[PDB]
Design an enzyme around this catalytic site. Sequence first.
Site, PDB file in Angstrom:
ATOM      1  N   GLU A 196      -4.841  -0.768  -6.711  1.00 54.98           N
ATOM      2  CA  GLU A 196      -3.908   0.120  -5.844  1.00 54.98           C
ATOM      3  C   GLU A 196      -3.425  -1.536  -5.299  1.00 54.98           C
ATOM      4  OE1 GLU A 196      -2.979   3.448  -3.139  1.00 54.98           O
ATOM      5  OE2 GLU A 196      -4.731   3.402  -3.675  1.00 54.98           O
ATOM      6  N   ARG A 224      -3.938   5.863  -8.214  1.00 54.54           N
ATOM      7  CA  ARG A 224      -2.653   6.529  -7.684  1.00 54.54           C
ATOM      8  C   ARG A 224      -1.817   5.973  -7.747  1.00 54.54           C
ATOM      9  NH1 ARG A 224      -5.646   5.212  -1.693  1.00 54.54           N
ATOM     10  NH2 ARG A 224      -6.201   8.050  -1.451  1.00 54.54           N
TER      11      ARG A 224
END
Length: 225
Positions: free
Chosen positions: A34, A93
């Site tokens: 991420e 995510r």
Amino acid sequence: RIKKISIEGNIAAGKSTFVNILKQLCEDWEVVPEPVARWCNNGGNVLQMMYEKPERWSFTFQTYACLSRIRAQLASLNGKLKDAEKPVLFFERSVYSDRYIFASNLYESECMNETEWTIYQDWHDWMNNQFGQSLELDGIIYLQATPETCLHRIYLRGRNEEQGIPLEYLEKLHYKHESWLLHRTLKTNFDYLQEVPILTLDVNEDFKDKYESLVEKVKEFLSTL
Ligand SMILES: O=C(CN1CCN(c2cc(-c3cc4ccccc4s3)ncn2)CC1)N1CCCC1
Ligand SMILES: O=C(CN1CCN(c2cc(-c3cc4ccccc4s3)ncn2)CC1)N1CCCC1
């Protein structure tokens, strides 16, 4: 066809740890880290500004984060991994949590105004109407921990700029994850996410006593897609 799986969870729930376990197993499994995970310690300089004045920098921060996410995830689809026959790509995510958990929360806390929030959504919708097909998720892994588990893990991880995070904030992001991923009561602009299978993992215990059962459950889950 590369199976896309996102790993979701609250702050310091144990995403990185979990990714560390996953990225170790085999050739065919690869993780897409991420952007905001990487920043935390040039452009990622927005982070330092967010630490000083979030009301000023939220829109810029979320805009850059999501664009960084989109490119890295697109980039990653183009291995030299496109083989063989069960390649899996794990996303730390997704574009959805970017918007419906984080950007969304920043607006509700008045760190973005109506206009910033409309523009961001307008921008987000468009981006995903242009690349949605490519980045569509085959599964979501939800790392479920209590707000207090997360508060304590923030403390342990030791980032000095994270030491002022109140529990009420973690409770809010917690509700949103529960609402989206456990109860599926949070409605989004992406109706394919209503079908997407979801593995919920309780990560409240120490990962060191659990990571084996965890991987066992992930494999089990991957084979069912
Ligand atoms: O009206 C405000 C503005 N504000 C809302 C609550 N806050 C936040 C901050 C953040 C963040 C700060 C930060 C820093 C780096 C990266 C991501 C983030 S997200 N997210 C939600 N609410 C602190 C500032 N305040 C109420 C509490 C302190 C001042
Ligand atoms: O911003 C994040 C994740 N993230 C939020 C929590 N972070 C924070 C939050 C806060 C705060 C949240 C908050 C809430 C109320 C009052 C003060 C504060 S300070 N401070 C530093 N880093 C950094 C990482 N992301 C953007 C897109 C996907 C992840």
